[PDB]
RNA sequence: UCCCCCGUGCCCAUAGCGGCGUGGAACCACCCGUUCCCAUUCCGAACACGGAAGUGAAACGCGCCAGCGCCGAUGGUACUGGGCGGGCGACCGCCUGGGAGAGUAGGUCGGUGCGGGGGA
RNA sequence: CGCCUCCUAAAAGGUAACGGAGGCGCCCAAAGGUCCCCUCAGGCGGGACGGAAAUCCGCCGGAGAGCGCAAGGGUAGAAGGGGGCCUGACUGCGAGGCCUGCAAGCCGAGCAGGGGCGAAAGCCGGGCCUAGUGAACCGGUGGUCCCGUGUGGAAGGGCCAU
RNA sequence: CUGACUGGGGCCUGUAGAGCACUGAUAGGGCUAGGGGGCCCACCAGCCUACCAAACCCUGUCAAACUCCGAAGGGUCCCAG
C-alpha cells in the first residue's frame, strides 16, 4: 500500500487542518468522484481499503484513479513509555485531506456501478463524503 | 613561435618506392619510404594487386560439363 | 553568455570605478585610438581626444602618444588633473601604454 | 608564408571547384581549413614512466611543433587517476604547419597504414568537421623503427569553416582525403 | 595545532629577538621557516627564522 | 530510548542595522550578513565577514539594481 | 534640433533565445603580415605590433516575425491587522480595514543620458 | 553537558522541550598578499588502444559545477582555475559601531614606521563567510634592563613576547 | 516633552496563503535508454510484449528543515499629535 519510496526526512511535525483543499477540487480524469466533506489524515490502510472495495465491486472492469497520496509520516511512542526521550517511531503514513478534495475517481463503468462502489468506498473512510459526477465546471478548470 | 622548444622545419624530399619524389617540409631533409599515394592500390585507380579473381568460385568451377543429360 | 573580452572589460573597469576617480577610458580600433575622460557619478564625458578626430598619421604607437598629449592639454584647460587609467580589455602595453604615457607628459595625474 | 603544394592546390584547384559545386556568393563563405588538432590520449604514462618526453619528441618531429600536456580534470578510480595527472599531449596546428602536416598525412602516412582501405566516410562531426584516429606513429615518414620504444596511436581533428557535413566532405575530398565509401 | 602542525617563533636574524609567533606543518614544511618581517627593534624588515617555541 | 539530536548554535543577530534615511557616522555598521546579500555602494566598506559599514558621516540609502544586486549607500550630509 | 555609426553609462529580460532581412562611403570587424615591442603549459586562436589588397562570409549594428523566454491586468478568491460570533472538538462563520498566488485578457523582438565621427 | 549550520521560530532581533536533522575540537608556507590571464557542470555529434566516465574537436549550455571539511548564505561583472613577483599570516595605534547582565566575542576607516605587488588607480594588519576553543591562579623559556631590604653587586621579582 | 499609543513617509522581512522554477516526494498517461519474459537463434543480429521500469513530456498533487511568488502585520528612523 501507498508509501514514499524515499524521503528527505523521516518525521514531520504535525501541522494543521485548516481551510478548504488547496487544489484537487475538480474531477480531472474519470466520470464520477468521491469528495471529502471534512478534514482528516487519511491513512494508507484506509485508502487501500477504499480501493480494494471498489475493484471488488467491479469484479473485472472499470479504472480506479486514486488522487490523494499518503506522504505524511505518522509517529507513535512505544506503548507505556513516559513523555520525553525524543520523538516516536513512524508507524504509518497519512494523506492530509481537507474539505473539497476529490480523493477518488472512477471511469469505464455504468452510473449505478460508479455510485455504488464510491458509496462502499466511502464507508471505509473516516470522514463524511459526497459523490459527484463530472460537469462543465470540472471541464473548465 | 617560442624559441628553443621546436624542431626546425626545412625543405625536405620524401622518396617513395614507385620512384616518386615529394618536395615538402620536414624536420628531416631526405626521407625514404616504401609506399606513397601515387602507387598505393586503394589510390591508384583500383589496382586489383594480386587477386584479379572474379571471385572465382563458386558456380565457376567448370571441370566440367561431362556429366550426362 | 559573455566572452573573455566582455569579462575582462568589466573586471578591470569595476575595480577602477570603485576608487571614484574620473575615468580616462581608451578605445583601440584596428586603425584608430580614442579616449574620453568620464565622470561616472554623472555618467558624462568631460574631455575627448582621438586619432580619428585629430586626423593623425601613421605609426599607430606614435599616434597614440600624440592623442595622449592632446588629451592632457584639453584636459588641464578644464581643471582636470587626476584621473584613473581605464585600460579596458587591453593589456597595458603598446598603443595604450603610449596613450597613457603621453597623457602623463601632458601633466595628467596618474 | 611558405609555398607548400597542398596550400597551393587548395587556392588553385579546390577553391574554384567548390564555388562551382555550391555556388557561393561571397569569397569568405567558401570553406577553409581552420585548424588541425592532433591529440595523444595516452595515459599509459599515468604513473608508470611519465617520461612521455619520448612521445612529445615523436610528436614534435611529426608536426614540427612541441605538444603541450593534458592533465586529468577529475580523480578516477577504475582507470587509476589522481587529479592533475599527466595523461595526454595535444598540438594545435594552424596555417603553414597545418598544411605541411596534412600534405604528408595525405601523401605518405595514410598510404603506410596497415590494410588501408580508405578513411571513414561517417566520421563527420555534423557541423562540418572531421575526426579520425591512428593506431601507430610508424605511419609518419619521420618516425623509423629504430627510434621507437612502443606503439602508440593518436586522435586527429580537422576543423573547417564549412557549416555542413556535405560541404566539408567536398573540401576534404577535393584536397585529397581518400574515403572508403 | 597537532603533533605535526607545530607552533614556532620567528627571530630577527640581525637583532636575535623573537618577534612573531606562528605555526607550520613540519611534514609538509620540514625546513626551518625564513620570512622577511618587520623587526620592531631593528626598525626595518629583517630575515626572520623559525626558532623553537 | 534517547535522542541523537539536541544541539543548535547561538543565534548570530544578523541583518540590517540601519535602514534608509537613518543618519549614520563613519564606522557605523549598516549590515550584518553571510556573503553578499547587500553589496557595498557609495561610501560603504565591506569587512572580511561581509559586514557593511559607513565610510563617511551621512544618511543611508538602499538601492535595488536588479541582476546587479542590492546596495547600501551613505550620501554625505 | 533629425539620421547613421563609434565609445561609455543608466533602467535591469517589455532589453533574452530563435527565424528572416539588411549595412561597408564613413566607422567597426574580419582581413594582410609576424621585422620589431609583446605573446602560446603547443598554436600570431588569444594577447601584441606593423599594415590597408580584399569582404561584410564570421562578428557587430540596425530592421522585421510572438514558436520559446520574459512582462501582465481588471474581476473574484486565499489569507489577514482590528472587532464579533459558533462548535465537545477537528474546525466554522459575520463586521471593518488591508489583500495575494495561480489563471484569464493582454503586452513585448527595448527605452534613455553623455561625448565623439559622419550626413542633411 | 562547550562550539558551528538548518528547521521548529508565529516575514525585524530574540525565543523552550530528554523536539526534527547534521557537523567542530582541524587545516593551508599556499590553501596567504598582489598583478596579469582564464571560465564551469551537464546534454548531443565526432575521434586509435579507450570503456557510463581518462585525453582531443564541434554545437548547445547563467550556473544546476567549483569554492579543503557540516550546513546555510554568498559567488563566474569571481569568492572558482593558471601563472609571475612576493611574506601585510605587519609593528605602533585606532574614529566609530555590531552584539551584550558581566566578562567576553565581532567589524573596522584612518594616521605613523618599515615593506609587497601594480604602469597606475590602488590593494595587502592571513584564509568567501559563519565552528576548529578555554578566564584567573601557579610555573617554563626569550627579551627588557624597571625594582633590588644600609651601599655596589647578586638572589628574587616587574614589564614585553610566548 | 523627549513617553506609551497614534498620523504620514522611507527602508528591512520571507511567515499566512500559494506555487512547483530549485531540492525531494507523487498517481496516471505519453514518449522512450535499461532490464524480466515470449517468438527466432548461437554466425551475431532480429521481432513481439496487457511485465518491472531511468531520463524526458502532459494531466493532477505533496513538503518544518522546498520557493518562481508572497500578503495582512511586524521592526526601525524621520516629521507631527
Ligand atoms: Mg505538534
Ligand atoms: Mg490517525
Ligand atoms: Mg502522531
Ligand atoms: Mg516525547
Ligand atoms: Mg510521536
Ligand atoms: Mg497508521
Ligand atoms: Mg486536500
Ligand atoms: Mg464513513
Ligand atoms: Mg490548475
Ligand atoms: Mg557522420
Ligand atoms: Mg565547422
Ligand atoms: Mg616511419
Ligand atoms: Mg601573530
Ligand atoms: Mg543519543
Ligand atoms: Mg534537537
Ligand atoms: Mg542564541
Ligand atoms: Mg537557542
Ligand atoms: Mg541558530
Ligand atoms: Mg535584513
Ligand atoms: Mg577587508
Ligand atoms: Mg576573507
Ligand atoms: Mg528608493
Ligand atoms: Mg545615493
Ligand atoms: Mg554603441
Ligand atoms: Mg547607448
Ligand atoms: Mg544617467
Ligand atoms: Mg548582405
Ligand atoms: Mg544579423
Ligand atoms: Mg570597408
Ligand atoms: Mg565596397
Ligand atoms: Mg622574430
Ligand atoms: Mg624593424
Ligand atoms: Mg594573426
Ligand atoms: Mg594590407
Ligand atoms: Mg553578415
Ligand atoms: Mg568584439
Ligand atoms: Mg499572473
Ligand atoms: Mg485584485
Ligand atoms: Mg475580510
Ligand atoms: Mg481575528
Ligand atoms: Mg477587504
Ligand atoms: Mg499572497
Ligand atoms: Mg496576480
Ligand atoms: Mg508587434
Ligand atoms: Mg523579445
Ligand atoms: Mg548622441
Ligand atoms: Mg568549547
Ligand atoms: Mg529565528
Ligand atoms: Mg526564522
Ligand atoms: Mg526571526
Ligand atoms: Mg515574528
Ligand atoms: Mg538586538
Ligand atoms: Mg538529553
Ligand atoms: Mg556529535
Ligand atoms: Mg600558486
Ligand atoms: Mg584564495
Ligand atoms: Mg599568486
Ligand atoms: Mg563538455
Ligand atoms: Mg563522446
Ligand atoms: Mg573506440
Ligand atoms: Mg569518450
Ligand atoms: Mg554549487
Ligand atoms: Mg565532510
Ligand atoms: Mg623584490
Ligand atoms: Mg569602540
Ligand atoms: Mg561589551
Ligand atoms: Mg607602499
Ligand atoms: Mg604605507
Ligand atoms: Mg615599483
Ligand atoms: Mg587597514
Ligand atoms: Mg580558503
Ligand atoms: Mg576558515
Ligand atoms: Mg577566539
Ligand atoms: Mg587558586
Ligand atoms: Mg580556582
Ligand atoms: Mg608569574
Ligand atoms: Mg642591596
Ligand atoms: Mg638598579
Ligand atoms: Mg642586606
Ligand atoms: Mg665592587
Ligand atoms: Mg645601582
Ligand atoms: Mg655581573
Ligand atoms: Mg634578573
Ligand atoms: Mg627578568
Ligand atoms: Mg605580558
Ligand atoms: Mg511633545
Ligand atoms: Mg522617539
Ligand atoms: Mg515614539
Ligand atoms: Mg506610526
Ligand atoms: Mg502552508
Ligand atoms: Mg517541484
Ligand atoms: Mg505547469
Ligand atoms: Mg502545508
Ligand atoms: Mg520553514
Ligand atoms: Mg514554507
Ligand atoms: Mg509600523
Ligand atoms: Mg513604518
Ligand atoms: Mg512631538
Ligand atoms: Zn609511390
Ligand atoms: Zn629587530
From Swiss-Prot, chain A:
Provide the GO biological process annotations. Answer: translation
List, alphabetically, the InterPro entries matched.
Answer: Ribosomal_uL16 (IPR047873), Ribosomal_uL16_bact-type (IPR000114), Ribosomal_uL16_dom (IPR016180), Ribosomal_uL16_sf (IPR036920)
Q: Which Pfam families match?
A: Ribosomal_L16
Disulphide-bonded residues: none
Record's GO cellular component terms: cytosolic large ribosomal subunit
Under the GO molecular function aspect, what terms does this record hold? rRNA binding; structural constituent of ribosome; tRNA binding
Any keyword Secreted? no
Q: Which UniProt keywords apply?
A: Ribonucleoprotein, Ribosomal protein, RNA-binding, rRNA-binding, tRNA-binding
Subunit and interaction comment = Part of the 50S ribosomal subunit.
Its family remark reads: Belongs to the universal ribosomal protein uL16 family.
Which function does this protein serve?
This protein binds directly to 23S rRNA. Interacts with the A site tRNA.
Record's protein name: Large ribosomal subunit protein uL16
Curated annotation (Swiss-Prot), chain C:
Mind telling me what this protein is named? Answer: Large ribosomal subunit protein uL18
Q: Which family does it belong to?
A: Belongs to the universal ribosomal protein uL18 family.
Q: Which UniProt keywords apply?
A: Ribonucleoprotein, Ribosomal protein, RNA-binding, rRNA-binding
- Which GO terms are recorded in the biological process aspect for this UniProt protein? translation
Q: Name one GO cellular component term.
A: cytosolic large ribosomal subunit
Q: Which InterPro entries match?
A: Ribosomal_uL18_bac-type, Ribosomal_uL18_bac/euk
Presence of the UniProt keyword Ribonucleoprotein in the record: yes
Asked if the Swiss-Prot or TrEMBL record annotates the protein with the keyword DNA-binding, the reply is no
Picking any one GO molecular function of the record gives: 5S rRNA binding
Could you name the domain of life of the organism this protein comes from?
Bacteria
Assembly notes = Part of the 50S ribosomal subunit; part of the 5S rRNA/uL5/uL18/bL25 subcomplex. Contacts the 5S and probably the 23S rRNA; has been isolated in a complex with the 5S rRNA and uL25.
SUPFAM superfamilies found in the cross-reference section = Translational machinery components
Q: What does this protein do?
A: This is one of the proteins that bind and probably mediate the attachment of the 5S RNA into the large ribosomal subunit, where it forms part of the central protuberance.
UniProtKB/Swiss-Prot annotation, chain D:
Record's keyword terms, sorted: Ribonucleoprotein, Ribosomal protein, RNA-binding, rRNA-binding, tRNA-binding
Tell me, what does this protein do in biology?
This is one of the proteins that bind and probably mediate the attachment of the 5S RNA into the large ribosomal subunit, where it forms part of the central protuberance. In the 70S ribosome it contacts protein S13 of the 30S subunit (forming bridge B1b) connecting the head of the 30S subunit to the top of the 50S subunit. The bridge itself contacts the P site tRNA and is implicated in movement during ribosome translocation.
Task: Provide a Gene Ontology MF annotation, just one.
Answer: tRNA binding
GO biological process, any: translation
**Tagged with keyword Ribonucleoprotein:** yes
Q: What is one cellular component GO term in this UniProt entry?
A: ribosome
Task: Name the family the entry cites.
Answer: Belongs to the universal ribosomal protein uL5 family.
SUPFAM superfamilies annotated for this entry? RL5-like (SSF55282)
UniProt gene name: rplE
Q: Report what the protein is called.
A: Large ribosomal subunit protein uL5
Subunit annotation: Part of the 50S ribosomal subunit; part of the 5S rRNA/uL5/uL18/bL25 (TL7) subcomplex; has also been isolated as a complex with 5S rRNA, bL25 (TL7) and DNA binding protein II. Forms a bridge to the 30S subunit in the 70S ribosome, contacting protein uS13; this bridge is straddled by the 5S rRNA. Contacts the P site tRNA.
What is the superkingdom listed in this entry's lineage?
Bacteria
UniProtKB/Swiss-Prot annotation, chain F:
Locate the region Disordered. 1-14
Single GO term (MF): structural constituent of ribosome
**Assigned keywords, A-Z:** Ribonucleoprotein, Ribosomal protein
Q: Name one GO biological process term.
A: translation
* Entry annotated with the keyword Ribonucleoprotein: yes
Function (record text): Found on the solvent side of the large subunit.
Q: What is the protein's quaternary organization?
A: Part of the 50S ribosomal subunit.
Provide the family line: Belongs to the bacterial ribosomal protein bL27 family.
Q: Which PANTHER family match?
A: LARGE RIBOSOMAL SUBUNIT PROTEIN BL27M (PTHR15893:SF0), RIBOSOMAL PROTEIN L27 (PTHR15893)
- The name on file for this protein is Large ribosomal subunit protein bL27
Amino acid at each position: 500500500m501507498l508509501m514514499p519510496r524515499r524521503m528527505k526526512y523521516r518525521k514531520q511535525q504535525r501541522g494543521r487542518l485548516k481551510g478548504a483543499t488547496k487544489g484537487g477540487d475538480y474531477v480531472a480524469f474519470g466520470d464520477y468522484g468521491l469528495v471529502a466533506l471534512e478534514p482528516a489524515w487519511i491513512t494508507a490502510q484506509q485508502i487501500e481499503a477504499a480501493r480494494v472495495a471498489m475493484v471488488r465491486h467491479f469484479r473485472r472492469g472499470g479504472k480506479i484513479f486514486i488522487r490523494i497520496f499518503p506522504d505524511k509520516p505518522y509517529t507513535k511512542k512505544p506503548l507505556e513509555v513516559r513523555m520525553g526521550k525524543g520523538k516516536g517511531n513512524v508507524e504509518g503514513y497519512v494523506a492530509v485531506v481537507k474539505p473539497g478534495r476529490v480523493m477518488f475517481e472512477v471511469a469505464g463503468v455504468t452510473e449505478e456501478q460508479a455510485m455504488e462502489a464510491l458509496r462502499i468506498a466511502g464507508h471505509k473512510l473516516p470522514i463524511k463524503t459526497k459523490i459527484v459526477r463530472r460537469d462543465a465546471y470540472d471541464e473548465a478548470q | 613561435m617560442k624559441e628553443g622548444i621546436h624542431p626546425k622545419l626545412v625543405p625536405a624530399r620524401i622518396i617513395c618506392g614507385c620512384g616518386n619524389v615529394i618536395e615538402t617540409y620536414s624536420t628531416k631533409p631526405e626521407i625514404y619510404v616504401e609506399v606513397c599515394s601515387k602507387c598505393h592500390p586503394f589510390y591508384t585507380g583500383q589496382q586489383r594487386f594480386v587477386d584479379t579473381e572474379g571471385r572465382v568460385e563458386r558456380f565457376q568451377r567448370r571441370y566440367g560439363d561431362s556429366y550426362r543429360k | 553568455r559573455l566572452t573573455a573580452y566582455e569579462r575582462r572589460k568589466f573586471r578591470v573597469r569595476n575595480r577602477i570605478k570603485r576608487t571614484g576617480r574620473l575615468r580616462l577610458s581608451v578605445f583601440r580600433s584596428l586603425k584608430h585610438i580614442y579616449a574620453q575622460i568620464i565622470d561616472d557619478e554623472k555618467g558624462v564625458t568631460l574631455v575627448s581626444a582621438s586619432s580619428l578626430a585629430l586626423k593623425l598619421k601613421g605609426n599607430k604607437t606614435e599616434v597614440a602618444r600624440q592623442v595622449g598629449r592632446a588629451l592632457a592639454e584639453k584636459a588641464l584647460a578644464l581643471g582636470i588633473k587626476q584621473v584613473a587609467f581605464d585600460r579596458g580589455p587591453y593589456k597595458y602595453h603598446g598603443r595604450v601604454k603610449a596613450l597613457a604615457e603621453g597623457a602623463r607628459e601632458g601633466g595628467l595625474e596618474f | 608564408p611558405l609555398d607548400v603544394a597542398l596550400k597551393r592546390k587548395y587556392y588553385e584547384e579546390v577553391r574554384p571547384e567548390l564555388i562551382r559545386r555550391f555556388g557561393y556568393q561571397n569569397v569568405w563563405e567558401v570553406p577553409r581549413l581552420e585548424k588541425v588538432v592532433i591529440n595523444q590520449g595516452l595515459g599509459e604514462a599515468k604513473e608508470d614512466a611519465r617520461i612521455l618526453e619520448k612521445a612529445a619528441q615523436e610528436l614534435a618531429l611529426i608536426t614540427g611543433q612541441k605538444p603541450a600536456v593534458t592533465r586529468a580534470k577529475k580523480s578516477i578510480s577504475n582507470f587509476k587517476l589522481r587529479k592533475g595527472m599527466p595523461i595526454g599531449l595535444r598540438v594545435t596546428l594552424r596555417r603553414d604547419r597545418m598544411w605541411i602536416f596534412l600534405e604528408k598525412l595525405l601523401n605518405v602516412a595514410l598510404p603506410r597504414i596497415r590494410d588501408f582501405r580508405g578513411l571513414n566516410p561517417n566520421s563527420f562531426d555534423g557541423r562540418g568537421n572531421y575526426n579520425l584516429g591512428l593506431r601507430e606513429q610508424l605511419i609518419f615518414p619521420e618516425i623509423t623503427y629504430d627510434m621507437v620504444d612502443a606503439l602508440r596511436g593518436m586522435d586527429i581533428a580537422v576543423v573547417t569553416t564549412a557549416e555542413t557535413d556535405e560541404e566539408a566532405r567536398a573540401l576534404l575530398e577535393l584536397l585529397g582525403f581518400p574515403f572508403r565509401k | 595545532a597537532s603533533e605535526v602542525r607545530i607552533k614556532l617563533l620567528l627571530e630577527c636574524t640581525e637583532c636575535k629577538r623573537r618577534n612573531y609567533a606562528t605555526e607550520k606543518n613540519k611534514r609538509n614544511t620540514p625546513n626551518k621557516l625564513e620570512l622577511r618581517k618587520y623587526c620592531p627593534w631593528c626598525r626595518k624588515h629583517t630575515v626572520h627564522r623559525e626558532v623553537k617555541i | 530510548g534517547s535522542t541523537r539530536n539536541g544541539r543548535d548554535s547561538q543565534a548570530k543577530r544578523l541583518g540590517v542595522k540601519r535602514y534608509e534615511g537613518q543618519v549614520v557616522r563613519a564606522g557605523n555598521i549598516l549590515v550584518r550578513q553571510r556573503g553578499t546579500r547587500f553589496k557595498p555602494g557609495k561610501n560603504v566598506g565591506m569587512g572580511r565577514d561581509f559586514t557593511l559599514f559607513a565610510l563617511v558621516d551621512g544618511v543611508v540609502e538602499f538601492q535595488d539594481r536588479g541582476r546587479l544586486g542590492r546596495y547600501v549607500h551613505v550620501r554625505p550630509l
